[PDB]
Design a binder for these strands. Structure first.
Ligand SMILES: [Zn+2]
Length: 171
DNA sequence: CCCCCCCCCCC
């Protein structure tokens, strides 16, 4: 049957759990957790100094990229399915080992290096190591917009199916 | 060699 966790950490609802609730508290035990939506308002307040972690839904896997050094990497759109997103850069092993992940997945991110751009591009974080990514499961509220683009292509914006079936762009 | 690696959709 359906098995849904209503997580206090991420503030998300997760199905297809890859771990027990006890295992969650263990991973987050000695770590300062910051909600993925609080991130942009948390820059420059010593929130990311020590060991920290966040968690969000994979909204967009973007396109294949190549580093200046010639290595491949990823740029993910992550969020809590609430009109607010954030950029995640997957480098090296992290990209190798998680670039095939499915949109809708719920990932815990550990100790990402933070970049904040007050020029409009906003909050972003990056990780490069395998243990910096933990798939907790699948967002039970995740869905794709049922609306269509201007050119007739099905919209691929992530939505909260519990609160509606369309983007900010479709109403 | 390792670490490093860094953004123009959907209105
Ligand atoms: Zn749409």
């Amino acid at each position: 049957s359906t098995e849904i966790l209503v997580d206090k950490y991420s503030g998300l609802r997760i199905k297809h759990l890859t771990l027990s609730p006890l295992e969650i508290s263990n991973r987050f035990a000695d770590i300062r957790f910051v909600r993925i939506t609080a991130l942009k308002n948390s820059v420059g307040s010593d929130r990311f100094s020590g060991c920290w972690a966040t968690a969000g839904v994979l909204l967009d896997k973007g396109v294949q990229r190549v580093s200046a050094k010639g290595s491949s990497y990823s740029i993910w759109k992550m969020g809590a399915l609430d009109e607010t997103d954030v950029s995640l850069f997957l480098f090296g092993d992290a990209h190798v080992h998680y670039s095939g992940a499915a949109v809708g997945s719920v990932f815990a991110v550990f100790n990402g290096n933070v970049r904040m751009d007050n020029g409009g591009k906003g909050f972003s974080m990056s990780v490069a190591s395998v243990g910096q990514m933990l798939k907790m499961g699948v967002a039970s509220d995740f869905g794709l917009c049922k609306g269509k683009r201007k050119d007739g292509v099905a919209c691929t914006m992530a939505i909260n199916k519990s609160k509606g079936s369309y983007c900010k762009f479709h109403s």
